[PDB]
């Protein structure tokens, strides 16, 4: 909806946001969202994302679809009405993104979703990519498996010619919708080939305060190799605007850097992260700061 | 409606649109337009504005949908008749932009919304932009308090990979409607996503003559940086052609000039502001003339 | 329709072109057409004139739209058959443009519209446009306002974020029909957004010829800036192919080129124009020939 | 319909085609068709031309439109049918072009339509372009003139901004086909604005056959000069092409050339023409050979 | 169908295709066809063609057009089912190309279509382009009778501005299919206009198939004169890919060279032409080895 | 389905993937699968694959097409449901890929087809393709036969201009389902018409994890000879990101890279391959590692 500020409304707002990253416990935000939807209302729709076509499919608090629920209006805070209706399995009145509110007046942050090697991490998304040889897949896979901690990493494939990969878009909203209804800390295993149909376009422009608004993180490979402006400037765009995160290589091979937004309006933090092979490919993040915009394109040149 | 001059009549409305900008009260006619639309029959269309597909929607004084109206037309002073029809949900019959006449005669003005610092800003749209260090996110926030003075300002957010941000261009439009017909200053965080679907194209072309006629200021930020002369030449468009004013950074980090289209025929104004940041990146405009087309130019040549 | 010529016809209708221009009483032809025009039966399609769709609404000659008109065919004198048909406010059969011959067989004419400071100007349609710092907006006002003469002119405001501007092409288009219809001197307040739908290209190639059949004139202004060669050079094939005239800013602040097009197949003239600011911006032109292809080109140059 | 060939047939052929261009009666072509037209069945459809949208509208001999015409088989020589249906005033099946056969075994010719100045010209489409200062209006006026001999030339006026011009393109194939099939010599003013529909890329196609084969010739300008090499390119493909006949401006003021196609897999030829102006621009022809492929695109270069 | 091979099979394939060029009786494959489709239920659909939207129109064995046709489905060898359906002139079921098996196992051959001036030339389709003076029409004509030998060539016209030629594409495909039905040597006098409708796009893909299939051979000219690198790499990519053999004129007038696809997975032969005018512009082919994919680049980077 | 892990499942993952090439028998996969196949109920719907329009077919195990299936839903192991229903011969629920579960938790892999020469060769799809003298046609041939073994291997034949060759899209993927379905060796000659439909974009992106599921091996030529960086691109990313392996010419003729991804996250392998000819061209593989990102970039810089 929309908010109205005043001087000291403002300031108590950037003070909530900056808690959020830099202060709250990690991973609390998702446990607080968690409790609001399971206080939903059964059969209440709660997700909406769209498919191929630029229809939407809607799901449950429980990651179900529903194809059917009569025209239910709610108003707003701010007198905004919400009127959400499915059809014949699609949103026939509504909006994509979530369709319960879990964030109230507390919005524009970057709910810290893990903590580890003495740096905080954001929830959203975070697009693993850049030039030269560190291996994203491999990356993406122990980021998962850290950010974790104690929780097992949920992993959506998609697009890759390898066994059992899903190759249709609209199977693939479908387990990113569950993996976000269900887990804190998910791994997508190529947005290649969604880097244009109508629900691609959307799933670029949704997938990161669709995370952010939960709570959880999504992890994304995207490999920038392609001599193609078009594309390779659609790479740089996802990257700049509809990352919460970013996780780029370097000129070292092994070594990559984190840049996080910390928040609306705050200051993108920098790290450097070092890593190792083990076996079969398993790898390691070892473990024993502000950046201007400037700093931020001099890193976008590298995919180029 | 059109309107009809000789000299006379001609001199008159450059001398009440100079007034408008240079002399009248700053707000008031944000304050003018409130009664107009308040004198308005209960469940009249007033505004409509476009959807993503190009349909539009339609609200009433209250800000409240119209989901039906049957057939009404009005004939104006100048012999047009306005024909509105609602059904459905959406605008059957009619045009985008105000449904009932706020200007009558005194059209082509960009109606003072605030003086702040001892400078006079405009209502209507202003782009916050241009590349180098400077914050917008920050700065529109600055904005919109510092013209709000003794009122709030309403935060429209939209296509920020943030929690509780809106991705859905509908519900944006919806937002950005109701914001319009109740509050005199306006901040949209984030144009970034419009910049097409035909909704996105429509609403360009649309909000600043929208605002300048209600003297409400819609104060939104567009970064520029995206070296994809397509969308590159599309932010200068907008910023030289579909914005009332324009305030863009500059060489030095915290400073930035402010362009101002004081009216219809009129001279551009230009002044420079200088910045600081507080905690947590709350930022504050320090308080304590005419420009040529070349200038402009100039300044445009900023965003490449 | 389709006219057949012998050497002794033709020359007789090149004197007959040359003459609506260089010698009949400056504004005589919109005086006959108007003429034309009243003697119509009631209820009769005068007018038609495309809307952004493509599709066209219709006029009667009090410029009031036309809902309902059942199928009724004339047959012209060269064969050509004529059937005009209006059904649910939209032509169902005719054509884009007169409805009704304002010409019979003298065509191919700029006739001229009025004549100030010594120097005869053709109606048709005249573009404002060219680089640098001389103000298009008070230039055409002033033109409007000196080939108004002892009359007023009429201004169709589209498409500037300014107040009481309307931004929907289908009510431009609906204004402009009513301003041809009632006026002999039209102004309009930037072709900018139109320069693109069926119905923007279907204005630009029909007003010209609409309002020469007429004999009003309509001055517009358009603004070349804007490193688009697409769009700058529809702003060129603009003012090459679809003006009756050209008023072009030069070198010299204040300083204007004007060229037009006397008539089919004849030479197209050139003059300069001196102009200087007063109060509010009000502009004036100050008052106390033949030229080629090449020349034009070299004009058309000053658009890059 | 497919015609097949030995040698002995294919030189009969040639030495045929040769013939209908160098010593064939000029304008006997003409003749024959003419009476081929007026034998036909009174309602008989003879002729479809494609509309804007791509459908075609037919007529019968007498240049009238049939509205409704039921399905009808006709077997042809080679074995193929054809059929044709008029519904709703439009082809439901049937093919663009002539509906009758005007040519028989006498295909691939360029029947010569009239001698003047000691040559003879060829029937089908002339395109009269080129860069510099020659115009082009009075040129293909005055070739209209000189071709049309003892007879008058037919005018279709269509997308100029001048009195009385048509502008809209379904009207303006209506003319054509009128005038093709009413005269043999037929000038159009402006192919400028069909330079795209799918009814405007048909008429560039199909216009130089149609008028081959009714032995008519329709003389039409095409300026060059707009710097959109998606333009000029189509501009040259159009004169290359889609004309029978070539005539182009050259360095010197007042002299053209002529290039011939004199028939199927035959040479083309050139000459050189001389002109002046009188009064009121009329333009005059002064009175008193094989080129190769290499010269041709020498003289398409010229319009770059 | 699809095929399984094994060393043994695959040899034997190699040896049938390098026969079906090298040592077949020259026009032997065509005179195998006929048989095939004569042997043909009466009434049975044995061809389909697209026409310009991408639908199909089929014909039987006698060239005639099926109109209406129920449901039927044959399974093949292989295991794949073959269902055709005809409803209201159009294919509603089936695929474009051959709808009866005419080749079995004897697949990817270039078939022997005849042999003049002690040079064997293959069926399927031939390309008849190149820069230069040397004249394609006139080439093309010659190849035909040529290769027509004792029998007479069928030549389609099409898209020409010359007497009687066909402009509408959809009664271009009739004309091929019915060539290919009864001919074994086509000429098509343009292809020129092919060169993008779903139609034009499906004939350059399909035709040489189809031809090399019915053991035809099908002679078109191509100008590759067009400095659009978006037609001219059309151009070539039909010249490399769609054609069974290329015919290209090189830097001595008269002169060609011919290069030929002898089959699948085999080498490409090329010979050299030399040719002379007579009367009336009738060419003459003056009658008394492999190359590499590096010489053939060499070949198509002529046309540019 | 989603799947979850945390460092211990992951690191048996990876040890799973890396035997399932590594150290599986050769053709292993491939009999486990059709074992899954067979046991599934009859009538079951198996794979869907799309057509031109972005349609799917479906089809049973024994490669029989299915034209009804009445909706029937499916619970997976992660919670979502699978829904197939087929209307009309078309999917009217369910997605493109296999519609039987063939990987269980077992996915990514790239499951050895075959060993030769010493060498492991992936299932999945392989293409073959770059510039140079060395064939394409016969090295696919020698893969098909050498990969084969004691089976012999299935030939899908499109878009050539050759005798028999199936030139329609949709009869292509049905050749190709029906080969995935019944054999493990199968090749592809001419990737290069499909090279944009959207079942042609379907296909690129479906058809390696189809074939890698099924543990099948796909063998497609595609020739990058083609100066159009809009094709040549669609030629490199197809051959980055859309093959399970890539088989390349060098600057040696005869001789080969082979590049083979081995498993999801794992290292790509490269060995050459040495060839030579024998009768008819058919072409015999001589028989008596790890490469990184910047290795393959370098040979894809090849096709340019
Ligand atoms: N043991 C290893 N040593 C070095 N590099 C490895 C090792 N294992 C995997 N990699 C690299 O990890 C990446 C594998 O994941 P993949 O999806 O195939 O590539 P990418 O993520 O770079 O697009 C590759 O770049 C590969 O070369
Ligand atoms: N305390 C600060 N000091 C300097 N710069 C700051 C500070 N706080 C925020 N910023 C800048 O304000 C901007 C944050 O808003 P954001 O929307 O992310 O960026 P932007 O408006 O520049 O596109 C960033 O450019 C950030 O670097
Ligand atoms: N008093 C003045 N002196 C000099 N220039 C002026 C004066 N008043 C207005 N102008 C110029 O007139 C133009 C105002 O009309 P506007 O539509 O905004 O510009 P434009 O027509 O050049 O696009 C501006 O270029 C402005 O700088
Ligand atoms: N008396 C004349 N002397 C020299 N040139 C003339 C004369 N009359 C007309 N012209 C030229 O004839 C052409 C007029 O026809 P028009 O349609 O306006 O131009 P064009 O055919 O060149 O596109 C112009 O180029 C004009 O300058
Ligand atoms: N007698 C001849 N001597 C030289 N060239 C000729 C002769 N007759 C015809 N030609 C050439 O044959 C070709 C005629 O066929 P056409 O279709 O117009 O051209 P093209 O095949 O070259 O595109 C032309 O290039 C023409 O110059
Ligand atoms: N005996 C041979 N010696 C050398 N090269 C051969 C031999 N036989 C066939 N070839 C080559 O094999 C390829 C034939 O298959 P084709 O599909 O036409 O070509 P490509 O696969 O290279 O596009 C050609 O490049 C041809 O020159």
Redesign the pocket.
């Known amino acids: 909806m929309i908010h109205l500020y005043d001087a000291k409304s403002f300031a108590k707002l950037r003070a909530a946001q900056y808690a959020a990253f830099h202060t709250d416990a990690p991973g609390s935000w998702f446990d607080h969202t968690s409790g609001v939807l399971e206080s939903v209302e059964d059969g209440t729709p709660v997700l909406a994302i769209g498919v191929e076509s630029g229809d939407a499919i809607v799901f449950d608090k429980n990651a179900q679809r529903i194809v059917a629920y009569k025209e239910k209006s709610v108003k707003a805070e701010d007198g905004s009405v919400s009127v959400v209706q499915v059809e014949n399995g699609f949103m026939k009145q509504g909006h994509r993104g979530w369709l319960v509110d879990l964030t109230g007046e507390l919005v524009g942050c970057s709910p810290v979703v893990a903590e580890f090697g003495g740096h905080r991490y954001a929830s959203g998304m975070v697009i693993v990519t850049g030039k030269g040889n560190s291996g994203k897949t491999p990356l993406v896979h122990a980021l998962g498996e850290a950010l974790g901690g104690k929780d097992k990493y949920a992993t959506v494939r998609f697009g890759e010619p390898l066994s059992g990969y899903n190759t249709d878009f609209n199977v693939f909203v479908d387990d990113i919708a569950r993996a976000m209804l269900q887990h804190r800390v998910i791994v997508i295993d190529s947005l290649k080939n969604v880097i244009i149909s109508r629900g691609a376009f959307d799933l670029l422009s949704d997938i990161g305060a669709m995370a952010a608004s939960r709570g959880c993180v999504v992890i994304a490979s995207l490999n920038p190799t392609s001599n193609d402006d078009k594309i390779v400037e659609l790479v740089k765009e996802a990257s700049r605007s509809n990352s919460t995160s970013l996780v780029i290589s370097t000129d070292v091979d092994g070594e990559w850097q984190v840049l996080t937004?910390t928040g609306?309006?705050?200051?993108?933090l920098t790290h450097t992260l070092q890593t190792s092979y083990g076996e079969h490919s398993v790898l390691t993040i070892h473990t024993s700061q502000?950046?201007?915009?400037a700093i931020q394109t001099v890193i976008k040149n590298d995919e180029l």
Do not use: F, P, V
């Open positions: 937004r609306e309006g705050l200051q993108r502000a950046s201007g915009k």
